[PDB]
Amino acid sequence: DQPRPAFSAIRRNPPMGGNVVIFDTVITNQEEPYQNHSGRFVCTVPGYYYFTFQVLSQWEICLSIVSSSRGQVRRSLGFCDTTNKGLFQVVSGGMVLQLQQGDQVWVEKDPKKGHIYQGSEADSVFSGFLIFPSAKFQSVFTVTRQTHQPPAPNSLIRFNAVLTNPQGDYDTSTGKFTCKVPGLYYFVYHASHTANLCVLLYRSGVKVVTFCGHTSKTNQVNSGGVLLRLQVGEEVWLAVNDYYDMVGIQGSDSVFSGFLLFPDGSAKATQKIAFSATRTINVPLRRDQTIRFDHVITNMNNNYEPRSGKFTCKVPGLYYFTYHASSRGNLCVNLMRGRERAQKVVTFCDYAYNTFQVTTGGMVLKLEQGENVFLQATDKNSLLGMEGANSIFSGFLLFPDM
Ligand SMILES: CC(=O)N[C@@H]1[C@@H](O)[C@H](O)[C@@H](CO)O[C@H]1O
Ligand SMILES: [Ca+2]
After folding, report:
1. With a 6 A CB cut-off, is 247 part of the ligand 1 pocket?
2. Closest ligand to the CA of 11
3. What CATH number is given to the structural domain containing 22?
4. End of a domain among 238, 262, 286?
């Protein structure tokens, strides 16, 4: 069969000490590459993988996805939240890594900024999955912005440094991705800032989504992302508006990744399953209400129902689900999986006092045919959905037939 390595793990009863962040409770671990006793993913199948975390702090936290090869540690970008006010904050980050057999990948905390919430109210997650195995028409990039000076107001955000870009599809001299291989792409970013920042994602000259985060002095991470089916020559890029700050503190970086999931014309079209939907309704949510994302950007194979907000599995398999929510107050959402009655997988909470925020969560889930996945509101219901402060829910099948 084709290789299907993919995992998600959360914290519940983590072992104590060291700077490796151990996610002790496994949600998904197909081919068991993840070691919950150590917090380390081990590569068996060489290739390009995507790794991401969404970790809850109440104080100061700085985290970095670290890898090793032949036992030698390879340090990398960091992501921090230093709000430091006692309220829940989600720090997030992610990147593509090209790995060889035996390489390991993990999340490390800064020993001086290492606060991670411990308790039952909300969750922290680490996930990863193979994008394509090594050894052929692919597209993948992770780029970063290696400068201390922020973008100009109302301009395209250039990411000048490359972590991986084997097809040259992101051009660091123009700041744009240009499609060579037509098909369905995932695009995602995590940008560090210490003043207000809105990031806009553009496709062929049209603004697709915008996410904003406000801060004064302390460091936070603005995240966003979307699935788009692109044709040859189409351009995608990120931009800022009047809120342009990308000045991270030491140890907090900015990354933009993208990768082709489903090439057009590569067969088993019914298996190309991907949706991205935004919420344009701002009626107050009540506790236990399914959160409807009414506006469809992408819905390949029509497994997402915008009238309900639920995804329903037709092709059993491994899926990655993700969301980014704008908000002006305290927000907790339950990620639900089940049939008639669904059960909570995790709760993500992210608090905000007298400000604007963008939070995110994601999870790899194995689904059987007929199971539903959706987001469910709680008593902490400050969720905002509008042009210039979007809320989006997305999901995609990881391993369609070759
Ligand atoms: C399903 C499974 O294997 N769960 C184990 C659990 O029994 C053990 O307590 C924990 C140690 O932190 O590691 C988890 O992987
Ligand atoms: Ca927050």
Report:
1. no
2. 1
3. 2.60.120.40
4. 262
